[PDB]
Amino acid sequence: KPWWEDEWEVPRETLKLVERLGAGQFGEVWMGYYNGHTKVAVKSLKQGSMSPDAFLAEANLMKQLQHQRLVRLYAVVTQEPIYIITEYMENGSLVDFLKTPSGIKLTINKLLDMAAQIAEGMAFIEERNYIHRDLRAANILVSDTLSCKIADFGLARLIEDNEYTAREGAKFPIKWTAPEAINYGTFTIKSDVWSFGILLTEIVTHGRIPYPGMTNPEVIQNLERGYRMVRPDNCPEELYQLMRLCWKERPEDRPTFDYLRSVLEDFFTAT
Ligand SMILES: CCc1cc(N2CCC[C@@H]2CO)n2nc(Nc3cc(OC)cc(OC)c3)c(C(N)=O)c2n1
């Protein structure tokens, strides 16, 4: 649909950017207000830093992935500077929130709760034949009621034929990315499952960096030996054994997100 017909199109005049939350190579991230009252998040593109089409590709994908557990597209402004406007999450990044005073006092119960909400979200993505590719605590957002939602769909893809394959020079965070995506550039929902495993260690260690004290090459070397991440401090053995299912050698042996959700819910109501 052209912008004069796209229901997600708004006049720039509806938006007032109030506080800049982030600034990077490709633009900024602002807290704003839509029509005076509705708090939103505004992602702006820095002209020339990258292609508008590439920039807008994220919003188009979000128009297809709507669910309570995924950050919602609020609107676009398709003339320079391009704006993407999304649901505003009051507590920000999960990796950050876990490190605040409020985050620090969270019981293992509530942590398992949040882990179940993330999985519930990825389960929806799972059924829709999508993948995320960038699943990690940095890309989970928390609300003012302490709920969690998947975010940043820049790399998310639709899987018609059951596999998406990237290019040669394409590089990804080694600690969070499954071996098959690192080695062959092949991604599936099972690749996400592996990331979800890493993400679980982020949750239980209040946002600590995975594979404590190991360089990327040490991590690859260890994984190939059959080793997995060492038991994090204060990690329920049940959770650790769940992480391990996520880290199974063969993608098809790794559990579904629906299984992961239901298991995390038993864990949560049990404590
Ligand atoms: C659309 C993608 C994106 C990126 C992003 N970013 C980008 C940089 C920092 C934050 C995630 O690390 N934040 N930060 C947010 N909230 C936020 C950020 C804070 O950081 C100053 C502090 C907060 O609590 C006072 C809340 C939100 C959001 N959608 O509400 C957000 N969204």
Side-chain angles (χ1 to χ4, degrees):
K1 281 176 163 183
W3 74 258
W4 61 88
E5 273 186 3
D6 197 46
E7 48 266 311
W8 281 283
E9 189 79 29
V10 292
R12 190 188 321 274
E13 290 63 41
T14 55
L15 300 167
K16 169 144 185 45
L17 283 50
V18 172
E19 186 189 355
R20 190 177 84 246
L21 302 188
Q25 189 175 2
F26 311 105
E28 295 167 333
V29 179
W30 297 73
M31 184 271 281
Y33 284 99
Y34 173 83
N35 288 170
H37 291 106
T38 309
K39 180 168 290 173
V40 300
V42 173
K43 185 188 182 181
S44 58
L45 171 57
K46 149 166 279 185
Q47 294 87 325
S49 73
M50 64 170 281
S51 166
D53 196 73
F55 180 83
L56 282 181
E58 187 188 356
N60 289 337
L61 187 155
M62 305 185 70
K63 303 178 181 178
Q64 312 285 327
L65 279 183
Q66 305 171 55
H67 190 272
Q68 283 289 143
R69 301 271 55 88
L70 289 54
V71 165
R72 188 187 172 267
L73 177 63
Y74 196 101
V76 289
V77 187
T78 54
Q79 88 203 145
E80 313 187 304
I82 323 279
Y83 288 165
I84 291 171
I85 304 88
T86 59
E87 190 171 5
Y88 183 83
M89 310 293 300
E90 189 78 46
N91 278 329
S93 187
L94 181 59
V95 77
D96 293 334
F97 174 85
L98 291 171
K99 295 175 175 175
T100 69
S102 306
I104 294 166
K105 299 157 200 160
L106 294 189
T107 59
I108 183 60
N109 181 247
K110 182 60 195 168
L111 296 175
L112 294 163
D113 176 25
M114 314 187 84
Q117 308 184 16
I118 300 162
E120 173 178 342
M122 288 301 305
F124 171 74
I125 284 173
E126 183 170 72
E127 152 177 9
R128 304 311 304 156
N129 290 344
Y130 279 83
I131 53 189
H132 193 283
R133 302 207 291 153
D134 205 10
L135 181 58
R136 57 188 294 167
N139 295 345
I140 300 304
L141 302 199
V142 194
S143 68
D144 72 289
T145 67
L146 302 193
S147 57
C148 301
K149 304 195 182 194
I150 329 302
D152 192 351
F153 302 83
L155 303 167
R157 299 292 180 264
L158 177 60
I159 304 301
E160 25 260 352
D161 211 44
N162 210 69
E163 199 176 64
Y164 162 117
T165 299
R167 74 183 180 92
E168 300 307 44
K171 68 319 201 78
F172 315 92
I174 292 189
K175 289 158 191 278
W176 281 263
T177 305
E180 73 274 7
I182 292 174
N183 292 326
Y184 318 132
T186 55
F187 286 86
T188 88
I189 197 63
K190 298 293 181 188
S191 301
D192 284 347
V193 163
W194 184 294
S195 293
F196 183 79
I198 309 296
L199 196 165
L200 285 180
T201 71
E202 286 183 290
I203 284 172
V204 80
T205 66
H206 289 275
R208 193 192 196 196
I209 292 177
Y211 299 94
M214 289 167 57
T215 66
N216 285 337
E218 284 177 311
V219 178
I220 291 164
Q221 227 285 48
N222 274 222
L223 290 175
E224 296 182 341
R225 293 189 70 189
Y227 288 174
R228 292 298 185 267
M229 185 180 316
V230 171
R231 293 188 172 83
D233 293 351
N234 307 303
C235 188
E237 185 59 22
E238 281 162 292
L239 192 53
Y240 183 71
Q241 282 309 318
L242 189 61
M243 302 172 172
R244 296 195 59 92
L245 288 187
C246 286
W247 300 324
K248 276 188 172 283
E249 179 79 9
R250 302 193 295 120
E252 71 265 31
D253 289 332
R254 302 174 200 161
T256 64
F257 275 109
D258 180 29
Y259 175 83
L260 284 169
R261 176 198 49 78
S262 66
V263 168
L264 284 158
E265 282 172 11
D266 287 338
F267 281 11
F268 160 59
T269 68
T271 68

